[PDB]
Amino acid sequence: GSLTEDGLSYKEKFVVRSYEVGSNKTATVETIANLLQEVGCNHAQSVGFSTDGFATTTTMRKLHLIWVTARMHIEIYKYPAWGDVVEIETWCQSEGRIGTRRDWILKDSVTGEVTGRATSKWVMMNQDTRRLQKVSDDVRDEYLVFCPQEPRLAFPEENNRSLKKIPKLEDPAQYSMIGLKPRRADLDMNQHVNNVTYIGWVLESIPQEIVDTHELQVITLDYRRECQQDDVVDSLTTTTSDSQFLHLLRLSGDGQEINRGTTLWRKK
Template identity: 45%
Template sequence: MATLTSQSAKRITRGRCFFGNPEKTKSSILPVKSCDNGGGRGGRKLVCANAVNGAVKVNGKAADFRSSAAQPVSVDNDDDAFRLGKFVEGRLVYRQRFVIRSYEIGPDRTATMETLMNLLQETALNHVMSSGLAGDGFGATRQMSLRKLIWVVTRINIQVDKYSQWGDVVEIDTWVASSGKNGMRRDWVIRDRRTKKMIARATSNWVMMNRETRRLSKIPEEVWEEVLPFYLDRNSIAGDANTSHRIQKLTDATAESVRSGLAPRWSDMDVNQHVNNVKYIGWILESVPLKVLVEYHLTSITLDYRRECRQSRLLESLTTMSSTGTPPSTLCSSADLQSTHLIRQQDDEAEIVRARAEWRCKGHR
């Protein structure tokens, strides 16, 4: 018999079962001969159903109809632990696990770069929430919310050694540190839960913006006091060399391919009313040659966010590709590749995102 967690047993009468608040009886036992399950030829009759002090038994087996909403939720519950993750290393590192879903893989049956970026973002937000610092903003602390401040990413670099497949479980560690006088750095490490091997890593830089004026802001002293106890001076990418180099600006003359007419949709917006930083990955790939997408893995990408983007703008995606060496003896037609990208506004050509990427032939072991 199915468990109905949203209602309690009200009374059981001959031939029919009603749900609501349980009624007290002299014996607290209400015998019935059958229970109406809605009719139909396949309906099963219940020989006996008893209600004893709010607990219902059908054919001698317990069936709990009491509301789960009244049950207190323990922070140690396995479901919450899976959903929210946990702190390790003295609460300096936050760890969360994810299963790669079928809708998170691409044509080659592995997780996409967009999937990895989304998982990084989810882990970061749950880190803030689980730390007890979360205010009413999207990843903002209490003091930030009081001052109408939000975090905005200025640069992110992710490097992938191996893409997970459907059904794999990944474990993501994240932590934060200072970045200069007025910024924050957030790092991640992704491991395969079964092998414990690191399969990807990422680093990013963030600054504060006033969510109403859309102007950058210094980090207030009160916010520093909130976040400093969680800072860990550790780099996921040694030297962070790939994020320190300036990314070349593409123009119509230097770009090999241009895709115009890219329109941000309402679903591309985040709660801060600008395009979610992960969405740019898809637009970047729109101008990458199909042969590259089919034959190569995107092993590294650095995104340099120049300005925020709203829904009303049409965008263009520009790409240029270059080879990094001698073609290997594989199915690929060339050696590993590098690419430079630009997402710009179509009307005035104002830069939104610059990016640099590295590609490895899928047949190259």
């Protein structure tokens, strides 16, 4: 992987692995999400961000600040097959005092065609109190050095899916998978649950017949609260319809919401 000529975006190629594919011999949406996270880390390192697991700036380190995921939105047109080379381009943009955004474009390395795109929203939080915060002048300034200054958007369309409001699922859910717990392979280097695990947990409550007869086209997931190592999760799904579902992840005990989202599936 490498930064592009202008130094305002980063590209990386990945060969799709045997263990990364599903029953149709193409990448799962979790493998895609992992590759998006990997190229994001490679970009942060190339532009001088800290290693240590947290991709923080020097001002963030002095003020005990971290980035927290608020939303992940992915749209896939073609999942790469086992052995294929997928090229991913990523870049960041500041969104005033609200937070920051990381966008991605996925391409077939052989044909050069776009096979997917993703967008993510990140908000500032104090690492110790876990209290949300607005982005300060000094953080916005250090972002201007490695972000395009004109808007560059993976989802440019006005009133598109990536910015849509997601409602809260009403009890009773049509489908469910209860008692989901993270194991050591679900944690990141800082022992926090990896963001991609939440996508897996959301999908667990989709019936296997939908997975066998349909392809996932779009997934939009809101992040509200982190699941701890010792927490237990319930994943709920209701068909809202192409097939569409409304999802909700909550703690098995108190019912505390941790995630909400939607998925759109196309018949094969």
